[PDB]
Amino acid sequence: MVTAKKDENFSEWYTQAIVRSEMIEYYDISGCYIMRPWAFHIWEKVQRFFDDEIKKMGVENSYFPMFVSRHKLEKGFSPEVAWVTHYGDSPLPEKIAIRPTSETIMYPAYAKWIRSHRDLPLKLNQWCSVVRWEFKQPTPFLRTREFLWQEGHTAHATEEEAWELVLDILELYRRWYEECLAVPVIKGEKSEGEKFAGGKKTTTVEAFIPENGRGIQAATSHLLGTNFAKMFEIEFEDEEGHKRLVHQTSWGCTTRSLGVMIMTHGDDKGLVIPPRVASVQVVIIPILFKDENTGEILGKCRELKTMLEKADIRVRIDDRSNYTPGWKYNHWEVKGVPLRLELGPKDLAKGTARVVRRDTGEAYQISWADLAPKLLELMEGIQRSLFEKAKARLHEGIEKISTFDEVMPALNRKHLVLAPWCEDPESEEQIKKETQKLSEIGAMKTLCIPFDQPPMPEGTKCFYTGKPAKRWTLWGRSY
Amino acid sequence: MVTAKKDENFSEWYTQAIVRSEMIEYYDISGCYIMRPWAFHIWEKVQRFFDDEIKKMGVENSYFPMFVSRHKLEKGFSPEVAWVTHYGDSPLPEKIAIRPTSETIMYPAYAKWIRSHRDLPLKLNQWCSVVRWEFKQPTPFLRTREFLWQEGHTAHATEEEAWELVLDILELYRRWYEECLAVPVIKGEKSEGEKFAGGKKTTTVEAFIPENGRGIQAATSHLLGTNFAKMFEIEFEDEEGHKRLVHQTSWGCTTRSLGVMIMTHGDDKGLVIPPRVASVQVVIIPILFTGEILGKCRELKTMLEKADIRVRIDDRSNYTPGWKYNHWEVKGVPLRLELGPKDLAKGTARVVRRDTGEAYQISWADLAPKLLELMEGIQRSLFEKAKARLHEGIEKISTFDEVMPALNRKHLVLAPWCEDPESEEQIKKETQKLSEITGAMKTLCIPFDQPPMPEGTKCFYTGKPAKRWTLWGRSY
Numbered sequence: 028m029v030t031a032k033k034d035e036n037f038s039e040w041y042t043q044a045i046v047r048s049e050m051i052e053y054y055d056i057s058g059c060y061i062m063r064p065w066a067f068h069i070w071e072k073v074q075r076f077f078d079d080e081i082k083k084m085g086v087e088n089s090y091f092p093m094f095v096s097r098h099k100l101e102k103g104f105s106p107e108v109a110w111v112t113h114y115g116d117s118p119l120p121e122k123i124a125i126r127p128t129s130e131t132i133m134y135p136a137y138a139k140w141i142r143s144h145r146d147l148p149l150k151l152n153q154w155c156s157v158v159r160w161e162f163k164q165p166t167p168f169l170r171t172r173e174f175l176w177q178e179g180h181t182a183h184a185t186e187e188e189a190w191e192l193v194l195d196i197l198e199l200y201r202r203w204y205e206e207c208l209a210v211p212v213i214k215g216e217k218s219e220g221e222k223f224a225g226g227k228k229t230t231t232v233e234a235f236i237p238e239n240g241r242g243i244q245a246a247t248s249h250l251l252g253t254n255f256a257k258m259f260e261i262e263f264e265d266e267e268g269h270k271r272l273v274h275q276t277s278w279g280c281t282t283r284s285l286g287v288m289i290m291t292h293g294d295d296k297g298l299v300i301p302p303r304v305a306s307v308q309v310v311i312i313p314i315l316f317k318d319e320n321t322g323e324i325l326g327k328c329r330e331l332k333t334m335l336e337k338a339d340i341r342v343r344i345d346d347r348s349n350y351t352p353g354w355k356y357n358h359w360e361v362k363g364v365p366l367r368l369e370l371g372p373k374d375l376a377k378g379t380a381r382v383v384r385r386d387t388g389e390a391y392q393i394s395w396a397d398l399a400p401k402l403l404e405l406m407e408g409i410q411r412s413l414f415e416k417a418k419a420r421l422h423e424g425i426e427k428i429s430t431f432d433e434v435m436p437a438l439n440r441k442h443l444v445l446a447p448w449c450e451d452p453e454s455e456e457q458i459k460k461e462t463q464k465l466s467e468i469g470a471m472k473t474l475c476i477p478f479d480q481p482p483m484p485e486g487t488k489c490f491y492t493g494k495p496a497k498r499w500t501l502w503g504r505s506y
Numbered sequence: 507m508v509t510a511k512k513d514e515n516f517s518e519w520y521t522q523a524i525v526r527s528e529m530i531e532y533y534d535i536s537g538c539y540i541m542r543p544w545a546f547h548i549w550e551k552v553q554r555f556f557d558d559e560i561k562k563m564g565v566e567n568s569y570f571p572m573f574v575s576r577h578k579l580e581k582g583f584s585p586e587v588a589w590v591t592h593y594g595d596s597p598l599p600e601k602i603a604i605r606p607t608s609e610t611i612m613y614p615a616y617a618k619w620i621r622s623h624r625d626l627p628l629k630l631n632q633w634c635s636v637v638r639w640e641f642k643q644p645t646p647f648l649r650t651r652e653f654l655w656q657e658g659h660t661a662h663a664t665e666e667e668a669w670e671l672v673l674d675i676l677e678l679y680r681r682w683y684e685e686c687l688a689v690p691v692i693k694g695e696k697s698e699g700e701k702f703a704g705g706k707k708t709t710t711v712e713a714f715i716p717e718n719g720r721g722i723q724a725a726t727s728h729l730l731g732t733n734f735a736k737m738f739e740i741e742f743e744d745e746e747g748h749k750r751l752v753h754q755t756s757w758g759c760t761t762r763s764l765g766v767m768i769m770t771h772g773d774d775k776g777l778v779i780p781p782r783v784a785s786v787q788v789v790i791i792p793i794l795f796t797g798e799i800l801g802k803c804r805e806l807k808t809m810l811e812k813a814d815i816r817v818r819i820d821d822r823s824n825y826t827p828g829w830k831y832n833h834w835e836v837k838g839v840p841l842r843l844e845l846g847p848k849d850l851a852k853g854t855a856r857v858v859r860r861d862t863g864e865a866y867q868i869s870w871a872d873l874a875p876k877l878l879e880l881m882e883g884i885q886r887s888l889f890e891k892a893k894a895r896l897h898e899g900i901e902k903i904s905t906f907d908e909v910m911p912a913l914n915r916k917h918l919v920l921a922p923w924c925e926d927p928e929s930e931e932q933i934k935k936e937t938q939k940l941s942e943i944t945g946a947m948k949t950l951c952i953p954f955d956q957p958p959m960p961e962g963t964k965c966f967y968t969g970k971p972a973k974r975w976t977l978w979g980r981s982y
């Protein structure tokens with residue numbers, strides 16, 4: 028069982044939650060972790076959701092190689108690239124890189140495949156892993172040296188169409204977090220200093236971890252413009268006869284999303300899994316002691332399971348004999364199963380069952396006949412409730428502010444700041460450095476410029492420079 | 507268009523078919539290929555099928571790391587391992603291997619997780635890619651230096667329960683080939699010389715490629731016995747408190763299956779994709795060179811999509827119908843639906859099946875049911891024709907003198923075999939040297955399906971008493 032307290036040592040709580048729920052197993056290669064089935068089946072849920080959704084958009088899956096030649100890759104990230112140099116004892120004629128991202132592997136094929144407006148839009152995605160030798164401290168899910176993701180890369184005839192796809196994908200990531208994982212996120216645009224330097228505009232959805240005050244980028248979606256098209260010579264012929272550059276997008280989201288989910292809903296007893304992505308929504312536990320009606324109990328459990336399945340409820344009967352009922356309660360609780368259904372002799376007589384919801388611990392006596400619709404109601408309730416409590420914590424954790432003197436105090440309260448900003452290059456680095464210096468006695472950066480802009484009253488001044496403010500910008504410590 | 511003939515220049519036919527169908531794009535790292543959607547969709551289909559089946563059995567998915575430390579990997583295969591030695595310009599303290607297979611990564615975890623009979627059976631699978639610096643000439647799908655696969659690894663309290671699973675997984679590989687891909691395969695046991703050396707018994711499904719007479723291992727399922735359990739110390743306390751070794755299995759199957767399917771069903775025009783796995787099952791081709799025809803095609807698409815038919819309309823501007831027919835034939839779409847002014851005028855559509863070229867006139871109201879029926883017919887007829895070519899490719903023989911003539915007919919041989927280990931090595935060498943006057947004949951499998959063995963039958967080679975029939979041939 029989990030013994031560290033989420034509000035005290037957070038990092039130790041997280042480690043305990045993911046190990047004791049059997050999500051993660053540690054590994055001898057640093058920054059790498061084993062995803063056990065309990066975590067993996069959650070990734071399968073969100074994977075299936077996103078993948079179904081992008082299919083409706085006409086995006087197709089493919090698989091490109093995990094290797095890229097030195098000279099193709101080498102056309103700030105350099106330190107992260109893993110190099111293969113040998114096969115057995117033999118040195119490769121030339122060393123080869125493992126993919127940190129697939130632009131240099133995909134875009135030469137894009138140049139070849141695209142000839143005319145007839146070939147556009149080209150819309151591809153891949154589910155794969157990538158390797159980056161991260162310099163930051165690793166954390167399971169959130170920052171790992173090998174991670175699972177999808178990366179989508181599209182090419183369009185016009186900026187308008189590309190940008191519309193950017194925003195579509197972005198909305199899909201909001202749905203991945205908000206609708207599947209009950210994790211609230213803020214859509215936004217990256218500052219000129221945080222955006223992907225290979226693109227024209229980077230959009231993002233951002234989450235927040237109240238326990239350490241860190242913002243975290245939850246996913247990303249780029250309008251690439253034409254810069255990659257010029258570099259790779261991805262050109263097409265218009266409906267006229269002239270050579271046009273394509274307008275591109277790329278987008279990706281990772282198993283980080285699972286870490287965000289765990290941190291968001293988990294409590295002092297361990298995991299809490301939103302019903303929508305729980306592989307086991309309801310666990311049935313027969314209560315067996317001193318041979319009291321052992322046969323009938325097991326019989327009704329099996330009957331209840333089938334009834335519940337007709338409603339598409341995902342049910343496990345834990346009928347393992349080599350474990351106590353109490354052991355089962357702790358087990359499925361640490362694992363975050365939304366609903367436990369208990370059934371002993373007393374309940375068997377009554378035509379009822381005791382049900383405990385994992386999020387609040389509330390118990391219910393419920394008649395066999397009402398189980399299906401009551402459990403469905405409890406599940407939407409759990410799911411909606413997890414989200415709305417997270418949303419309130421997110422909103423309690425953001426402070427509207429007007430001057431730089433408000434910054435350092437709000438960071439100490441472990442909050443982010445929404446502050447009006449002139450959006451000039453040098454200020455962000457100055458702010459990072461200044462907050463860096465003040466902290467060690469660290470750094471604050473732009474998280475995003477939210478799409479949802481509060482009113483900006485005429486003449487309002489940027490919080491740091493004093494110049495005229497353009498827009499409101501969300502700032503904080505971050506992963 | 508595909509121009510190389512499948513029976514005359516098989517190698518070039520293959521390359522042409524996979525490239526011109528847009529399944530594969532060539533790539534600058536040797537033995538690595540891009541899998542474009544037309545091929546990848548088929549991978550997704552077999553993966554969903556297999557994954558759905560092993561999940562019924564209680565197998566659960568996981569993801570172990572693609573890296574393994576030198577020390578863990580090294581507790582015949584050495585030349586194939588890809589080694590990472592640097593990140594950026596920084597040297598690692600020790601080199602790190604990309605996983606060729608996962609035993610050395612997973613089994614120390616199994617030793618940790620398994621303590622008691624109640625932890626068993628443990629049944630895991632993963633979908634991932636694997637890297638092997640293959641010495642043999644690379645072939646798209648069939649032999650590649652990076653390939654996609656699944657690998658399953660299970661641990662049980664008893665051999666009996668492990669064996670049962672080995673056989674259930676093997677039956678699933680038969681289904682993957684025969685039911686999804688319409689490729690007939692032969693279940694069998696590997697010889698001592700060909701089995702996984704790390705296991706006790708290896709079972710296999712073997713397929714046959716007529717155009718070059720070479721057998722090919724389609725997938726593999728091993729009874730590992732307790733030897734890895736000794737090696738990794740995977741032990742459990744039974745219900746009386748004694749330490750016992752777990753009995754394990756492992757099994758895997760790769761994107762090689764797509765290549766087997768391509769080769770089995772393709773013809774001189776290009777691919778033929780079995781309807782159960784095709785991205786597009788019915789391509790609708792408007793006979794155009796106003797909204798009346800496209801309008802009707804959209805209505806038809808919607809109607810077939812309600813019957814779960816995967817349909818695309820080829821409404822492209824600058825291509826004639828005849829160019830489109832050919833294009834979708836090279837891609838192997840099993841059904842073409844043609845709709846022109848005459849068809850629009852009569853309330854009917856002309857449907858042409860890719861495998862035989864037969865044409866059908868079908869009223870709009872009848873399309874969904876008739877196309878379902880046609881797809882089941884095409885699926886089955888691909889399998890049955892492939893099955894007949896398989897059994898025509900196997901010669902039952904009695905004596906060694908019948909071997910080379912059989913191999914020259916691009917045929918496999920089924921022969922009674924005494925099964926002693928040194929004889930397989932010797933037969934490999936004799937058939938090698940005789941071919942020279944890649945050419946070596948090796949065992950493919952000892953089939954579960956044994957032909958009758960008349961009492962007193964002799965080994966085709968040693969003349970000693972013959973146990974069972976063994977299937978042999980040239981192979982991949």
Ligand SMILES: Nc1ncnc2c1ncn2[C@@H]1O[C@H](COP(=O)(O)OP(=O)(O)NP(=O)(O)O)[C@@H](O)[C@H]1O
Nearest residue numbers: 161168169170171174244245246247279280281283
């Ligand atoms: N090391 C990692 N482990 C897990 N997920 C990651 C990792 N790095 C990035 N991600 C996630 O994948 C998304 C897309 O990757 P990408 O946009 O390439 O990240 P990035 O530019 O490297 N961000 P950062 O490393 O924080 O400067 C990121 O927005 C994160 O949500």
Ligand SMILES: Nc1ncnc2c1ncn2[C@@H]1O[C@H](COP(=O)(O)OP(=O)(O)NP(=O)(O)O)[C@@H](O)[C@H]1O
Nearest residue numbers: 640648649650653723724725726758759760762982
């Ligand atoms: N290079 C490859 N690329 C893709 N799939 C492969 C490759 N080599 C083998 N396979 C398939 O993967 C299955 C399981 O792999 P495994 O049994 O480990 O191969 P193997 O024993 O090394 N065979 P071989 O290389 O011919 O001696 C095999 O039964 C093959 O069908």
Ligand SMILES: O=C1CCCN[C@@H]1CCCn1cnc2cc(F)c(Cl)cc2c1=O
Nearest residue numbers: 104107108127128178223247277278279
């Ligand atoms: O948001 C994404 C992720 C999926 C598609 N690409 C964009 C930008 C990726 C930036 N990025 C992020 N990390 C990288 C690490 C590297 F080692 C190298 Cl060589 C490059 C990069 C790199 O370009």
Ligand SMILES: O=C1CCCN[C@@H]1CCCn1cnc2cc(F)c(Cl)cc2c1=O
Nearest residue numbers: 583584586587606607657726756757758
């Ligand atoms: O049959 C399979 C495939 C799926 C599950 N595992 C077994 C063993 C695979 C053998 N094999 C096959 N190829 C290998 C290549 C290597 F470089 C190294 Cl180090 C080891 C092997 C190796 O053990």
Ligand SMILES: [Cl-]
Nearest residue numbers: 071072073075
């Ligand atoms: Cl799923």
Ligand SMILES: [Mg+2]
Nearest residue numbers: 104107159161
């Ligand atoms: Mg990074």
Ligand SMILES: [Mg+2]
Nearest residue numbers: 220221222506
């Ligand atoms: Mg950054």
Ligand SMILES: [Mg+2]
Nearest residue numbers: 583586638640
């Ligand atoms: Mg091999």
Ligand SMILES: [Mg+2]
Nearest residue numbers: 699700701982
């Ligand atoms: Mg071999």
